[PDB]
Ligand binder design. Structure first.
Ligand SMILES: Cc1ncsc1CCOP(=O)(O)O
Ligand SMILES: C=C1C=NC(C(F)(F)F)=NC1=N
Ligand SMILES: [Mg+2]
Length: 226
């Protein structure tokens, strides 16, 4: 995964979304980079650097942590996505950036990042359609299930939006997020999603490598079976 000179294909994007691990230093009691390394070894197909909150790293310490996480992704051959921070994504030559409804406007971000991967968090049909129009390569829909990892989230929606989007003929790459575990991931894929994203199911697992491997194995099975 080098510098992109063309927009990523939908086929490739959907493959990358399979097991999308997201993490910040304040999401685990273990060593942050070590957990990321274990998740990648287990089978995570994409990683998002999400460092925010009161006890998250800032300044130079945050940048250095990001560099080490990006290096871990490079060693595993997995793309590195930055959450919220467009400047950081450009400065590190990240593979992509993820933004939400309260962040920089998607039109503005797409113009600033060229052909880098762009993900947009959506909670309604209107937002999903707007994201596609603005040039997003994928949308993150949720929260599917209850979650305490992110407090300022909108109402839990199950797989309702995923189903509605596919029903309207929209084929944009979709990843589900919010309280997803190895036990409840199947319905997300069966509803039409191209993958599942998670923080705590892997970051707080007593065995992150095994947890990631389990996710990878079952998601592959579900995608072939739906
Ligand atoms: C970042 C984010 N965005 C919507 S829900 C969520 C949290 C996912 O965390 P967990 O997988 O631990 O529920
Ligand atoms: C709020 C979010 C929603 N979706 C995603 C992703 F999984 F990447 F799509 N990441 C986020 N940080
Ligand atoms: Mg955001």
């Amino acid at each position: 995964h080098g510098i992109r000179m063309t927009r990523i294909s939908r086929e490739m994007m959907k493959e990358l979304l399979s097991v999308y691990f997201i993490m910040g230093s304040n999401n685990t009691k273990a060593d942050p980079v070590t957990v990321v390394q274990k998740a990648l070894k287990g089978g995570a197909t994409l990683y998002q650097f999400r460092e925010k909150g009161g006890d998250a790293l800032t300044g130079e310490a945050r940048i250095k942590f990001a560099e080490k996480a990006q290096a871990a992704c490079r060693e595993a051959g997995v793309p590195f996505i930055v959450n919220d921070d467009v400047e950081l994504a450009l400065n590190l030559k990240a593979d992509g950036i993820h933004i939400g409804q309260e962040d920089a406007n998607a039109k503005e971000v797409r113009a600033a990042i060229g052909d880098m991967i762009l993900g947009v968090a959506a909670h309604t049909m209107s937002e999903v359609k707007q994201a596609e129009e603005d040039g997003a390569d994928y949308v993150g829909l949720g929260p599917i299930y209850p979650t305490e990892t992110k407090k300022d989230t909108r109402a839990v929606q199950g797989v309702s939006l995923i189903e509605a989007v596919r029903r309207q003929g929209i084929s944009i790459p979709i990843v589900g997020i919010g309280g997803i575990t190895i036990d409840n991931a199947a319905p997300v894929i069966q509803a039409g999603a191209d993958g599942v994203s998670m923080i705590s199911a892997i970051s707080q697992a007593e065995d992150p490598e095994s947890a990631a491997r389990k996710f990878r194995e079952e998601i592959q099975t579900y995608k072939t079976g739906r």
